[PDB]
Swiss-Prot record:
GO molecular function, one term: steroid dehydrogenase activity
Organism: Homo sapiens (Human)
Activity regulation (UniProt): Subject to inhibition by high substrate concentrations. Inhibited by testosterone concentrations above 10 uM. Inhibited by the primary and secondary bile acids chenodeoxycholic acid and ursodeoxycholic acid.
Tissue-by-tissue expression: Highly expressed in liver. Expressed in testis and weakly in colon.
One Pfam entry name: Aldo_ket_red
Protein name: Aldo-keto reductase family 1 member D1
Catalytic machinery residues: Y57
Protein residues bound to substrate: Y25, Y57, W88, E119, Y131, W229
Protein encoded by which gene: AKR1D1
Location (main, coarse): cytoplasm
InterPro entries linked: AKR, AKR1D1, Aldo/ket_reductase_CS, NADP_OxRdtase_dom, NADP_OxRdtase_dom_sf
């Protein structure tokens, strides 16, 4: 059973993960400096012990600032905090994996991260530019080799630089390539995918459960609806009639119902908010539960429509979303 004070769930490698985390993507060009750092401090104060970030969000140093300040004020110990970082597509070449993680440790000013994941299964041309395209707008890809990249990840774990290893945006075929690798040393413990009542991931979730992989739900509130990335043809999740009526049964908001839904089925949720009130709101999901009927009601909202389709990379040989799951 899950409580505000105790809500970690086991990972297959013997580690554990707080089932709610603070998401920290925020559009760089429109986000004030300091907003992430403040939000992470507010979150930790509120009771969050998990923060999800990425070097390419351009605010990973702010996460470190926040975490190190709360440690310094003896609010938490490093051991109490779970940070997840990610290896971007431009950094999949095996010899670049460790230097890339070390860059994030410098940025964080921390000695290890709790979870390091392959951010997408697609390899992009190495370089500073996170979204490399040539003069004719053609995407500059690299040939993926998930097993060789995974081997470099394993070596980072053996060097003490990360406690747990995982993936993100992997489909079943891509998981199976790693799970079936000869000489596999560390199985992936986590797969971070989009997941919410309009995209409940029934087949992928079940597959991961069968392999002792925990799913982390990104965009668990249905995203910030940024038209650069988001399928806005889908309606806003938090305006869903049913979720809002379900919220009235418990004096909860649609967001609180949506987060409770996923954590209740052992899915980790990493809602992003840089708003003081909503950071708190999002954490108040341990003082109620959904009935089994309500869990079925919400599952039935599944449209099998993703808000985050990544359509610009549909031609990459390892584009994950052509397969059924
Ligand atoms: N691995 C990947 O490929 C990947 C991809 C996308 C995202 N992620 C991760 O997952 C995290 C979460 O997803 P996301 O940021 O896309 O989306 P999200 O968490 O689903 O929701 C984001 C939006 O919800 C708003 N919001 C937050 N709490 C709310 C509440 N209680 N009521 C109404 N509105 C609320 C936020 O605005 P305010 O900030 O103003 O509250 C923001 O506009 C990211 O921040 C990132 O850490 C991973």
């Amino acid at each position: 059973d899950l409580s505000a004070a105790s809500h970690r769930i086991p990972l297959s490698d013997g580690n554990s993960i707080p089932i709610i985390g603070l998401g920290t993507y925020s559009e760089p060009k429109s986000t004030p400096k300091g907003a992430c750092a403040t939000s992470v401090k507010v979150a930790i104060d509120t009771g969050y012990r998990h923060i999800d970030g990425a070097y390419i969000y351009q605010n990973e140093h702010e996460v470190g600032e926040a975490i190190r300040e709360k440690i310094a004020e003896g609010k938490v110990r490093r051991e109490d905090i779970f940070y997840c970082g990610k290896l971007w597509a431009t950094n999949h070449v095996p010899e670049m994996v460790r230097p890339t993680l070390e860059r994030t440790l410098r940025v964080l000013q921390l000695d290890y991260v709790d979870l390091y994941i392959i951010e997408v299964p697609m390899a992009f041309k190495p370089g500073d530019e996170i979204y490399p395209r040539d003069e004719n707008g053609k995407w500059l890809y690299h040939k993926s080799n998930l097993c060789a990249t995974w081997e470099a990840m394993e070596a980072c774990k053996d060097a003490g630089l990360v406690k747990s290893l995982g993936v993100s945006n992997f489909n079943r075929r891509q998981l199976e390539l790693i799970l079936n690798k000869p000489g596999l040393k560390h199985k992936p413990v986590s797969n971070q995918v989009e997941c919410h009542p309009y995209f409940t991931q029934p087949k992928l979730l079940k597959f991961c459960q069968q392999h002792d992989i925990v799913i982390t739900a990104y965009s668990p509130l249905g995203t910030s609806r940024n038209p650069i990335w988001v399928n806005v043809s889908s309606p806003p999740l938090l305006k869903d009639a049913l979720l809002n009526s379900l919220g009235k049964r418990y004096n909860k908001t649609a967001a609180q119902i949506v987060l409770r839904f996923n954590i209740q089925r052992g899915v980790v949720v990493i809602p992003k908010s840089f708003n003081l009130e909503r950071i708190k709101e999002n954490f108040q999901i341990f003082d109620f539960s959904l009935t089994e009927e309500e869990m079925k009601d919400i599952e039935a909202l599944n449209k099998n429509v993703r808000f985050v389709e990544l359509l610009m990379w549909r031609d990459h040989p390892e584009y994950p979303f052509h397969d059924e799951y």
